[PDB]
Design a protein around this ligand. Sequence first.
Ligand code: HEM
Length: 391
Amino acid sequence: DIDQVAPLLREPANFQLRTNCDPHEDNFGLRAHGPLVRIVGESSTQLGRDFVWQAHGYEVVRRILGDHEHFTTRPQFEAQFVGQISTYDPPEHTRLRKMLTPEFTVRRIRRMEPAIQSLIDDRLDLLEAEGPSADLQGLFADPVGAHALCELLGIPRDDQREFVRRIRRNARGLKARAADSAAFNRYLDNLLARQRADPDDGLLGMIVRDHGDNVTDEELKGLCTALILGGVETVAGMIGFGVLALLDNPGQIELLFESPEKAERVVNELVRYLSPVQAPNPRLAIKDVVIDGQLIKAGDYVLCSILMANRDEALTPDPDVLDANRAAVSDVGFGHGIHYCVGAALARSMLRMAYQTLWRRFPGLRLAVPIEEVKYRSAFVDCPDQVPVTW
Ligand code: HEM
């Protein structure tokens, strides 16, 4: 069942940009052209193509994200990607994934909660000290995402301050970046030498303990990088956007305290509605494949919009309303298939604690600026730049 070729559309001015927490109207106009379109603009140029496909309907995004038969996420050049699990295809992906799995179980996460609760409490103390107009993004969301990652890797408490600073620097000139990189790499080598010598219980220690000489230091450093890139800004973005979204839909705040089951639904509904990883790694076709009446040719790239897929009426009724009371559905906020977020259980747990502790301590939380004044970061993961609040 083949249709006319999807029409070439010029990339809209506000392609991938938002209006408050939502996709900018330009993205809905593009979606109105069909589940699969072809776009020409900055995206295709950046990928060295005349055009790129954009899958933005729910069914097609779920299908492509999970299809590792017809698509690869390997960069087309390599050593700079060693251990970057999201860019591996099976069988290599499978090996790295199995090394990570054991450290992300709910059992391991629960044991981590006291330290996470304590981090959240400390950052809210600072928010409270700052008083009215305090930047919730910079004082609470950002450091919670950064320090939670530090805890997961097992970064010494006294090194975290500097480590988070490094995390944000490489995130000033190529020469300065080369220096930050050299320093970060030196730090990781010393950290790994210590773990190889006497493995502790952290994520790195557990992998050294379980695989030892079956995993290289290059892979371990790449895995560290993958977790930092995959978990710091995403958590920070969910906290910031989640706060904005709950403040704009206050009736949802009480559901957070209704029951453990309802609180988990609020967190999953926020991930669906917000989808901070709006567009994951582009999928490069390695075999021709027919999808929804279009022929995607080997060599073509397909951008998958998780954000627009999760706003599809095909997924749920009134998808543009934040409503944790809707029947749970299989959204693609954490992805789908072999690359499904390895950190999903941890994110769900940290986000529930972050939001609940925040409203227990500042029940009268209120945005301190007009919603239209809030600015948003331009990066691989969507995230508010500053979120001034009062209470
Ligand atoms: C709510 C917060 C988060 C969201 C919405 C999110 C979303 C995603 C999505 C969309 C993918 C699929 C990427 C793709 O298919 O190309 C993914 C993969 C992954 N995420 Fe998350 N993530 C979040 C939190 C985290 C955290 C806390 C960590 C780290 C501790 C993490 C680590 C990763 C890694 C390393 C992958 C690659 C997995 C693989 O390739 O097998 N994520 N995530």
